[PDB]
Amino acid sequence: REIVHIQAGQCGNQVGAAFWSTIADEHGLDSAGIYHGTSEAQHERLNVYFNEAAGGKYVPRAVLVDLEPGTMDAVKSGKFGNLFRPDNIIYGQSGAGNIWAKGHYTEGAELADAVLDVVRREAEACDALQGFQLTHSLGGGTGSGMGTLLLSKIREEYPDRMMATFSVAPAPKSSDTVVEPYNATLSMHQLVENSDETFCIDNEALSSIFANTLKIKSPSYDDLNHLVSAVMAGVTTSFRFPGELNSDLRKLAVNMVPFPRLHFFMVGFAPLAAIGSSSFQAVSVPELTQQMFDANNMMVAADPRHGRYLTVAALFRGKVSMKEVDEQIRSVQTKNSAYFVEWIPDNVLKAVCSVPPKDLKMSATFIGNSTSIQEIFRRLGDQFSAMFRRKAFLHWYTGEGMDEMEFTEAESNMNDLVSEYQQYQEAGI
Amino acid sequence: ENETNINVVVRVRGRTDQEVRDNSSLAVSTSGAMGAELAIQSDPSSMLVTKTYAFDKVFGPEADQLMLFENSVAPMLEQVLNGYNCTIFAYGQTGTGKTYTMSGDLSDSDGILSEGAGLIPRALYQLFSSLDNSNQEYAVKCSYYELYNEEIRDLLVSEELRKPARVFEDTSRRGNVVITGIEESYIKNAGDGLRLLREGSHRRQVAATKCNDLSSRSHSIFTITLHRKLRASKLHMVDLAGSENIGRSGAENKRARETGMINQSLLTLGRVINALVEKAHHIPYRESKLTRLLQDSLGGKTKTSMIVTVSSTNTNLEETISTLEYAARAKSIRNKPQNNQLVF
Amino acid sequence: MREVISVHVGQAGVQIGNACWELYCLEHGIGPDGFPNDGFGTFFSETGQGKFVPRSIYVDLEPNVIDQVRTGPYKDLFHPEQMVTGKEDASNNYARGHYTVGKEMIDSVLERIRRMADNCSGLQGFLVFHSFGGGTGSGLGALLLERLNMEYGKKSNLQFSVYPAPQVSTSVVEPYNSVLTTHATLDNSDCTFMVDNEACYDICRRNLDIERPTYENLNRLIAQVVSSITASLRFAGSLNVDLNEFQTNLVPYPRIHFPLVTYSPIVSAAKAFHESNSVQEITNQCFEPYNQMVKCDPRTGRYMATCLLYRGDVIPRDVQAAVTSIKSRRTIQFVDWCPTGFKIGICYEPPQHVPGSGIAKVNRAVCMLSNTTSIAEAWSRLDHKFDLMYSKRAFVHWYVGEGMEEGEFSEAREDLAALERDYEEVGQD
Ligand SMILES: C/C(=C\c1csc(C)n1)[C@@H]1C[C@@H]2O[C@]2(C)CCC[C@H](C)[C@H](O)[C@@H](C)C(=O)C(C)(C)[C@@H](O)CC(=O)O1
Ligand SMILES: Nc1nc2c(ncn2[C@@H]2O[C@H](COP(=O)(O)OP(=O)(O)OP(=O)(O)O)[C@@H](O)[C@H]2O)c(=O)[nH]1
Ligand SMILES: Nc1ncnc2c1ncn2[C@@H]1O[C@H](COP(=O)(O)OP(=O)(O)NP(=O)(O)O)[C@@H](O)[C@H]1O
Ligand SMILES: Nc1nc2c(ncn2[C@@H]2O[C@H](COP(=O)(O)OP(=O)(O)O)[C@@H](O)[C@H]2O)c(=O)[nH]1
Ligand SMILES: [Mg+2]
């Protein structure tokens, strides 16, 4: 059971050094790549991400593709440079320009032939693929313009396996570049169709965690990307160890997705507290779940209280039994009858992994599916609306060769993705 | 008028000698005089008699081409000459006759005409026939391609060319869902209709089931552009593939694509009319490429006909009656026929 | 020898099956090798040396829980060619379960049965227990009976498949994978013993006073009623209740074959100490609904036919003097057309307790089985759910997208409601 990992883009690069650092520490690998086992769980399921080599040397399934040749040297010539086969590392010369219409016009047309060729032997050298991760961004060009074209090949290539993309979202307020309403919705056009699902993450929401819970007002991006690697590990936590139930990446997506259009999700994590709030916190299974339904613990700034939960999958790392979970959720589904969908009854999935984390007693990885996500999209389209009617910031896309009316196709795709959620945010049928 | 005009007809196939003489199949369909509600029963003088389904034109294993064609297609052939878009498509279980319904025979006796050739070669000539004697200028174009696993292959050309990016909308109308990146061809007469459709219908992917060696898997779609004179009414002749069961295919992973993804869009064809029994706050037309194209067809500005070809042999009771609820539920939806003289 | 065999499909087949064979070996006093009442090893195949092979086969599509058995304290017990693993899980998809990946794996399983079937002296019938909620045991077990009852014909078929209920749930396609299974169980199985995960849990909270029970504490309750039926014959007792006899004393009609399970006494450590154990007060426990295995209301409905399997030191006249204290005295009337309602046998030897559960040693034990009319509120819980899960056709594209036509969804609710039309008709005075 292997999956294929892609870090397409600059944000793909700096999440991956945050990703694989907490994965290699989780199975007991060092910072170099040699093995140091704790018990048999770390001996048998290193067959999830890692291909073998001579001795106890392990190589992760990864391709890390960028167009900007600078920041790849921060992980190649930088630390963990002995933990990637440099044939897998592949990157051109010219920068994108924070342009969707350039990473999908010309640069993918000059790398994604040779990028996909490296993906060939990584896929063939396992027995059974499971998923195909392409954790990227939507803001800049490389993570988006290649992030769609490298996506759209694989559905034409491997029409069976699954897609788990962790594309980060632009912010309604704290946005970072100026091409964000164009560089999102073009990528949102390709990502609704070909991707199986995605997990949105917004930085403006992520800043609210450190400003309310951990009480740090001066973090770093390297500190911030360190936090998302919880739920990166949190998804395949149920599989990489001896579990008790419902252990698969597929067992999530077969019943987290009611219709094959919506596919989008909200992410929460628990517990987390500063060193001042450390010991005074207790670690209880009812005490965790009350954190997981707060709007101060989500990774997208849309209010979940404002919407309704279609589906909820709870994935727990540690020592936790069955009705410990549910009996607190019983009181939750009484206090929140305006928050649960009625026409889909019994909307709670649960998943228990029987291995604790490091330096923790229990943990709770949360997957949510609100109807609040259309509001960010309506926020995104409203940002799109004033940007397009003037047709400013335009000829750096058509000048590369994308059609003018092709945007209106994407907005019509974008608007329709918004337009399915208003059935269900007010749903008595 | 502006009524609830949605045309639905049912014509079952005929049993063979080995089937019912072994199986003693259902007694659910009549000899097919006119459309009337029959029954749902098996072991009829016993405790399985449930209900009937109200019909428009039920026909048993008795109906022929010109019995159907003069009453179903021909009152809408005049609507095409009247300047209106029309839509005709068939549906049913696999191996029942819905490929026979659109394109039936390849006899093609080119002295005069063919016999039993299906609705499209009857609607081919009988639009070229009446157009020859109505004292106006005419120009005829067509485009014939297929739909297969969320992909489009041009059945007009055998070359390996496809769409550049995506299916396009327009800012002119809402009912347009235009498909560029694909060729339409010019047609002079009735003698050029079958001339391109012959090799054109051969370009599709006729797979082989355990049941039939002819029950294909693609979605044949036959579009017509009529530039008579200044005006143009597009006409949709659409084939649909079958609702394939699990065990009656022998399908491996190469066959499961044209099993699963085909049934994926046929299920999608369910909810796009299951949401029109009450027409709530969203109409999910954009779920697959089969229903984006039929957006102006299904409940839109276009007159729409529908064929439900089922099997009367007891190969099932699962979707023996389940497929007839599609015409039964979504009968009562309305449209709006609009005129087309394109002002230059 | 009155021989029996086992199969196990899904993790419910594994985890209940892990607890079944543990409790068996302590009854027959064997460890991994054996022998640290004379023989009677109908569960076991005898080798020429002493390593008794349990007549069983585990079937799972995902090699996760099978590694636990092949590495834990029971890898030195089984026949490692018999423990067949799959490649990729059904993953809560009955179409993947019953048809697609199961077809590519049944033909390394069905022939594996036949070698174990042709080694039988004379085989009576056997047991196929799994879950309805999950993927593989719902789907592959559905094909596993119809590809067996086609072959072996007049031989008996039982199943102890575990059943979902609205309080505690794990997956959210549990309405779909139950009612898509019950077509297979209607015409293939002679009988089934459905059991809840909730009433199984609640007795571990109330009548065991264990605060947070785990699944092995759930399963050791479950496997004990399994021991109290088959191997109850395999101790020499004063009476005999044969596997044929359940197929006479509990089934008036070929469709009414859904008994319930009730076990007694289930008393924790500090409470049997300070308690006696009569014959009569323990049979009084049996007709209390607090020892019930499926969340139903038996005092509302009537009983078509009952069965009481006593274990331990039992005199057979407190059978008769106390059964009329239940039958002739109490409020809960029987069916007017069933004239007696009771069948009862006495097995002399005591039940065996595990040394690591809250349950304690007791000199007598009753495994109540009864075909009631109050189980009609079990199917109404699912068919009301299966209604609203279907009325918008949500979560259907993961089934029809695999190959199942929707025509079974018509016949599921048509047959299941008509199956409830016999409980309202036979139970109608
Ligand atoms: C103390 C503690 C949890 C806890 C609950 S009860 C108990 C006893 N311990 C957390 C770890 C908790 O696992 C997360 C989710 C660890 C989450 C990972 C992030 C990076 C840290 O939580 C974040 C605050 C940090 O960057 C620093 C401050 C460096 C970390 O040390 C903080 C930090 O990680 O400490
Ligand atoms: N009785 C019992 N039921 C359990 C136990 N653990 C889980 N279950 C039930 O088993 C269901 C899951 O069934 P599975 O065996 O995993 O189904 P599957 O087809 O094997 O699915 P996967 O193997 O996980 O792909 C859960 O929904 C629970 O209802 C247990 O210890 N005892
Ligand atoms: N009503 C009918 N009358 C006479 N022949 C029929 C009829 N229906 C089907 N056939 C015969 O059935 C064969 C064609 O198979 P067909 O039944 O059309 O498949 P299908 O139902 O259309 N499936 P598919 O092609 O996958 O969409 C030909 O031999 C036809 O003559
Ligand atoms: N360093 C860092 N930046 C992030 C992260 N998530 C999102 N971003 C920002 O999101 C935007 C996306 O830009 P990006 O695709 O990386 O730039 P590109 O090189 O043009 O593709 C930039 O402003 C990034 O800084 C993260 O985890 N770390
Ligand atoms: Mg057909």
Residue numbers in the entry:
A (entry chain B): 2 to 430
B (entry chain K): 101 to 329, 351 to 465
C (entry chain A): 1 to 36, 50 to 442
Task: Please share text taken word for word from the publication where this structure appeared.
Kinesin-5 motors are conserved among eukaryotes and undertake related roles in cell division, driving spindle pole separation and stabilization of spindle bipolarity. Cut7, the sole kinesin-5 in fission yeast, was among the first mitotic kinesins to be identified and is essential for spindle pole body separation. While most kinesin-5 motors take steps toward MT plus ends, several yeast kinesin-5s including Cut7 have been shown to be bidirectional, being able to move to MT plus or minus ends according to molecular context. αβ-Tubulin heterodimers are the building blocks of MTs and are among the most highly conserved proteins in eukaryotes.
